[PDB]
Amino acid sequence: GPWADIMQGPSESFVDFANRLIKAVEGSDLPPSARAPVIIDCFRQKSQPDIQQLIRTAPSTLTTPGEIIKYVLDRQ
Amino acid sequence: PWADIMQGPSESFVDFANRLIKAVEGSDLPPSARAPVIIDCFRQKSQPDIQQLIRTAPSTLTTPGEIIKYVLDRQ
Structure with a gap:
């Protein structure tokens, strides 16, 4: 689905990319799970x-x- | 049931990986x-x-x- 081509732009903030991506995935054909x-x-x-790099070393929980x-966001 | 799968304390990593990949491939998930x-x-x-080891793995x-x-190389 189209969510699969979404990438964070070079001048795009993480929060904006995250919201954009989440909206595309929630509106997609994927099962909710x-x-x-x-x-x-x-x-x-x-x-x-x-x-x-921030996400790479995030806690596994x-x-x-x-x-x-x-x-x-806590690291920005 | 894929959603409930966890590695067992005596289960080799490779066995866990094969078990997990099998359950997911046979589940009702799209390939994507x-x-x-x-x-x-x-x-x-x-x-x-x-x-903890995977947490150190390169993002690539x-x-x-x-x-x-x-x-398998680092455990």
Whole structure:
């Protein structure tokens, strides 16, 4: 689905990319149970380099998009 | 039931990985959700020392195969 092409732009903030991505995934054909893992995978892989490093070493207990967003925002 | 899968305290990583990949492939998930679901389960539901090892993995490891390899080489 189209959520799969979304990437954080070079002048785009993380929060804006996160909201954009989350809206696309929630409006997609994925079963609801696949949304959180899919969103977090996109955060890890398609965010800008600095964000990718923040998320890389995040605690392994942060399993929701909101948890990861907080973690990143706390480090900005 | 994929959603409840966790590595057992005596289960080798490779056996866990095969068990998990099998359950996910046979589940009612679209193919586009399979790799993210597997990687998430690795990152979050492996044994504690394995979760910490994956947390150190380069961000450039983006497929289940690449993570399995990293763990087998470094555990």
